[model samples]
Target: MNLFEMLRIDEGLRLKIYKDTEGYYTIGIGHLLTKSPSLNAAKSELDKAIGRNCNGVITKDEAEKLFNQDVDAAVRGILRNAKLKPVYDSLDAVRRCALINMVFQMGETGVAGFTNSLRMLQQKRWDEAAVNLAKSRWYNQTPNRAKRVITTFRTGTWDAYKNL
Candidate 1:
């Protein structure tokens, strides 16, 4: 039920490089290695991050470290924004996790674009906020994950949806 464990499942673990749904090179708990469309670039970046030759693969411990760093970065990124921090603190833990998950998937700028949705969440209009989220391109791109995240926002509990 913890956010870390939830995200581990949500993102899934991979020791080897693979293309995501959008065809970006990704590895290890949804950590994207390429911002551009270059596999060689991603491999170099992955090796640098892991401090190893890697040989096209990484260890579980390395993946775990990266996952921790990625989660922290997402949290700090969310808090660093002036508009999000206040609203973030007002929500309960479950709702907060939902926000962090969104930020993790899309980064700060992308989630920050949801102005009205953020407002509704801050005002505790859970169902309305969920509705706004459902109307997003995010939902269109990944309805399975989006549905669960939206349900969390709606009910303010991880138990609101049955995670697979």
Candidate 2:
């Protein structure tokens, strides 16, 4: 598959700051920033990517390449997560993407905490799995994202967060 599709499958096509696994500030696809960059450097990267500078924000193009650089690594993490077992490969594309999205947002350990949801998914209980997904702190914090993933899991459609 293309890098763009892989990114959209996990990163949700956004250009905003969010917290990464270590709670570090990240922007655009998954650009984790251990330390802030110099203004000139940031501006140059921004210009190269989107030709606009807004201090800390990154353009979608910048984010895409950043993720692309390590997309295979991320996929390896997903494949290695013990929580995602035999059912992982058996799942449809949208469901597999949704699982990867969860891992991207919360890390493999974090996603593993959704034991009930995972069990329901393993059992092919789509509705139950959706309900279980909604009953998490992640869902409470990111309802829009949760809804999109829930819908994908239930419908087996890759239309989650299409507008955003």
Candidate 3:
């Protein structure tokens, strides 16, 4: 899809730095800060676009393009994780989306740490998976989001947690 559609679905049009869903210092859509040369380059470009202090304005179109690039990289990274590959292939779209969201919020390693929850999901034990997910540190840190994800896992229906 186009940048406009992608931005409408994935991000808020914030012109300044803010903490993202995973508490990363992000600006211009969902750009996450980490120690990487590519990120440094991107940040340099961003600094130029928005000024060194990030005080300048960026259009939603600019932010959307950057967000799409970042999300594509994240999705590729998640797909490449050996431990998560089978789980990724096994789940349905809704459940797979949940896993991808988790991977996006907390890197693949972080998602892999949810051993019990993953195991339950692999077994198709929805209730157990939900319980395991609820008991996670991730869940404790983001209760509202966790509840929605747990509901999705338990019910196999996106609408079950759509309001949350």
Candidate 4:
């Protein structure tokens, strides 16, 4: 499956699954995981937010369009969690996933605002990298989110927050 399919964008919109006020089987975008009734929607959103697009549901011809409109928006907000430079060439899956998550939360340019962390990582300064990561407005504003991303950066792997 392509990234969009992996993320569950049936008609170019995310499928949110959650319990409504009535607590029934509801599905669409921005649904809460605890309330989601379908594993597909929950897993898809989680993967989009945290993992790589391994299912390859998108077509090569449609990649650019989907990327600019769908996948890009999904990763915009999360990209602000770090400042990894030139993510295109990043080797660590954890780091890349963190960047994608940030982008999913932040947007391309918004993600780009993390210039210092990016510079430190590019310099191979792992300690400084982790420090810089924890120093973002994101770090100060969202300690929980910052901890998860920082953990991945330090350990090079996803931990408990994988579901978030």
Candidate 5:
């Protein structure tokens, strides 16, 4: 199975590593799920945590390092704040991945604010969803990043700029 299949990820998502001053790196998957460098040091510190070679290799230990003692707790907090069900009752894998990606970038509050977009997606209103995504303060806040994911959401393809 492809990595997305393994992860049960249905939507098009990407991973990125951002380096900081302490020779540490943060792992950001899709749009917003990020592991702090200080919390998860090993796999997160790798040159390519999001690369093909690194897929499925990040341990729970690594995930927990960034998550602290309770990954579930963090997720719950996000879900509560976003006001979306923690996991969509009828969601397919791709939809789940898309939500996770959005949560990762925007945090729970950010995700929750996209009610119109989420509603559009549930209705399979592709054009509307794309337009809603473009209309976010997020789009205005980070033009380049928003454009990259908007491309993926619309076309299911990714380019280098989206990855970095």
Candidate 6:
């Protein structure tokens, strides 16, 4: 699968407002409504994404729109990050998308904090890169998703998700 498809499968689409694993309000393929400073603003952003007064529910089309917006935001966010920009630009397409996937799940800062892992990626240390990724707190929390990302980082290929 491509990055977008892989990410949607990993993120899981949700049409109704719900608490994520950490109890933060989320909707539409892990789009984090809680990222807004207040619940009011969060709800407002959700409604804007749905392009209507959703009242905590969304349609499949709305969900896809939200997911795409998030993906674009993530790409720009990562590319704009000075610390991650060079690292991301140095990797192959698959590995670059792997970093984007991590940024989408966590955040640009969270992914950028992996100083050594980014170095390993820039150096093409595939084995070391996978090892670093697997040893993270992120790995402990989301092994399934993290493992797929790690494999993509290691192999620089879609082989990680093709089995499914």
Clashes of each: 0, 0, 0, 33, 6, 0
List the candidate 4 regions with Cα displacement exceeding 4 Å: 1-69, 72-85, 160-164
Provide TM-scores for the models: 0.88, 0.70, 0.72, 0.49, 0.48, 0.88
Computed on alpha carbons, the lDDT of every model, listed in order, comes to: 0.84, 0.69, 0.67, 0.52, 0.50, 0.84
lDDT of prediction 1: 0.84
Error of 5 at 160 (Å): 8.2
**What is the clash count of model 4?**
33
Pairs clashing within candidate 1: none
Choose 4 or 5, whichever is better by TM-score. 4
Candidate 4 per-residue C-alpha lDDT over 1-164 given as tens digits, one digit per residue, 9 for 90 to 100: 23333223312232333454456432332223344566666556544643444232333333434345544545443343344344535537556666555554445676677677777666656678789888887788657756766676666665534465
- After superposition, candidate 3 runs with Cα above 4 Å error: 1-13, 19-24, 33-43, 47-56
Task: Give per-residue CA lDDT, model 3, range 1-164, as digits (tens).
Answer: 23333233434457655556645457675565433335454456577655454443466766766666776776687678777877777887777767766675577789987877898898899998998888888899878656766777787666643342
Clashes, model 3: 0
3 or 6, greater by lDDT: 6
Residue-wise C-alpha lDDT for candidate 1, range 78-161, written one tens digit per residue: 789976887797989988888888888888888888899999988989889889888999999889779888998888777744
lDDT over C-alpha atoms for residue 91 of model 1: 85
The better-scoring model by lDDT among 4 and 6 is: 6
Q: Point out the worst 10-residue segment of candidate 1 by lDDT.
A: 155-164
TM-score between candidate 5 and the true structure: 0.48
lDDT of 5 by residue, 48-164 (tens): 433334532454444434333223444566556525673333345444545555555556677777778777666666677878889988789767657655655555444413335
| Residue 106 local lDDT, model 3 | 70
